[PDB]
Amino acid sequence: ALPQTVRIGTATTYAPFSSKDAKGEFIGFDIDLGNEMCKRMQVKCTWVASDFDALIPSLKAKKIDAIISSLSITDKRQQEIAFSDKLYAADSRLIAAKGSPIQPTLESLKGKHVGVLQGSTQEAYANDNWRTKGVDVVAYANQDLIYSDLTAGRLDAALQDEVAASEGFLKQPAGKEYAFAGPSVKDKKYFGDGTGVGLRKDDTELKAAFDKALTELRQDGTYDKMAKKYFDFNVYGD
């Protein structure tokens, strides 16, 4: 009962997982994973670009059938939607100017301007722990605006997925004079357990098909072959 075309939403401003190349075509590990799973599921797949915070609403409105967009598997989201098995791990961490004393603490961030992606686990954490207590937490439509507001000095720091920041910004020319500010933020309730394909709860058959494809491409070594294009480490985690 799988649709002839699985529509997959993604927010294409989160390299190296999802972004656009020079032609405007979808590139990144999420795209590679989704395309490889779709190949093995024997379905066609059409990618649909969207602001990150629109993904879960579009899914619930059936405007898309799946979300592959570094979507963290959280307790809160599982009350709304279902997930495939984990695609890869995702920790959260702050970035700031090289030499910044900033730590992911209320004390260190008071009077600071901190960027977070609207609709993200990072916004949830920052709004609850930081924004209410005086920290200027600013929500953004997409992560590229955040990077730009950081390098323009409009933001003192930004919270996002650690691997995204590292490969998508810090190790790029634009992020040369920036670094991680403090260690990963550990809060399993807000940040969840890796990312997965977001799905409607009643699409059990579609979930089983994604799950089957994922295990097979991991088993035969395709996952690691695809991952090496982007990462010299175990992006999957535990």
Which one among 84, 129, 143, 166 touches ligand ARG, defined by CB under 6 A? 143
Which one among 6, 15, 18, 130 touches ligand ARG, defined by CB under 6 A? 18
User: What CA–CA distance (Å, rounded) separates 129 from 98?
Assistant: 24
Tell me the site size for ligand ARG, rule CB under 6 A. Answer: 15
Stretch that binds ligand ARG, among 63-71, 93-101, 168-176, 202-210 (CB under 6 A): 63-71
Which one among 6, 8, 9, 11 touches ligand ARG, defined by CB under 6 A? 11
Stretch that binds ligand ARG, among 11-19, 96-104, 199-207, 212-220 (CB under 6 A): 11-19
Positions in 69-108 near ligand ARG (CB under 6 A):
69-72, 90
The distance of closest approach from Cβ of residue 90 to ligand ARG in the complex, given in angstroms and rounded to an integer, is 5
Q: Give whichever of 84 and 120 is closer to ligand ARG, judged by the CB atom.
A: 120
Contact footprint for ligand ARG (CB under 6 A): 11, 14, 18, 52, 69-72, 90, 117, 120-121, 143, 161, 195
